[PDB]
Design a protein around this ligand. Structure first.
Ligand SMILES: [Fe+2]
Length: 186
């Protein structure tokens, strides 16, 4: 029985319930994430920005069944084109807007990766991606407004691939956390 999360803490409690088992009801998880109304006071602790690139701030480690983190995107900050390491990935906007661009998995041939689609993710909206859907890039294209997003990955992963848009070639990257549970982790 899915109820509206009253607070971020309440959302986290609900997520522990939704991930108690071995599988993932994606539509239910997405619905609960969307239903949480972002309250900046509840997540200010995690919203640690860096001037030069977006930061990943760990919020909850789940049951070891998911990583829940907050990403802080300065004006103009964006990600690589990347995959999600055979995991579910939910992305909910807490503040601002992000542009998501979708790409197909490349062929062996070196070739320009052409976008398949793009969309604008707005405050409180939750998006979902997995490797079967494709690859994506996420960017804060705003010149004036930082963006903050809440990401849930299951199972947790600490590596993924970045793809070179000009060729489709991939390289493995290790994800690092800017902070964990509100504590800067240099
Ligand atoms: Fe992603």
């Amino acid at each position: 029985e899915l109820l509206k999360p009253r607070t971020l803490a309440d959302l986290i409690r609900i997520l522990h319930e939704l991930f108690a088992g071995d599988e993932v009801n994606v539509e239910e998880v997405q619905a609960v994430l969307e239903a949480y109304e972002s309250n900046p006071a509840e997540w200010a602790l995690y919203a640690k920005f860096d001037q030069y690139r977006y930061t990943r701030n760990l919020v909850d480690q789940g049951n070891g069944k998911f990583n829940l983190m907050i990403l802080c995107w300065g004006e103009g900050h964006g990600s690589s084109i990347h995959d999600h390491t055979d995991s579910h990935c939910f992305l909910k906007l807490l503040q601002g807007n992000l542009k998501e661009t979708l790409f197909d998995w490349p062929d062996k041939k070196s070739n320009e990766m052409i976008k398949k689609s793009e969309r604008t993710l707005r405050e409180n909206q939750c998006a979902y991606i997995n490797d079967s859907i494709g690859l994506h890039r996420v960017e804060n294209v705003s010149h004036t407004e930082p963006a903050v997003s809440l990401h849930l990955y299951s199972p947790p992963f600490d590596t993924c691939h970045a793809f070179d848009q000009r060729t489709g070639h991939k390289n493995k990257v290790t994800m690092t956390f800017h902070s964990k549970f509100g504590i800067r982790t240099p």
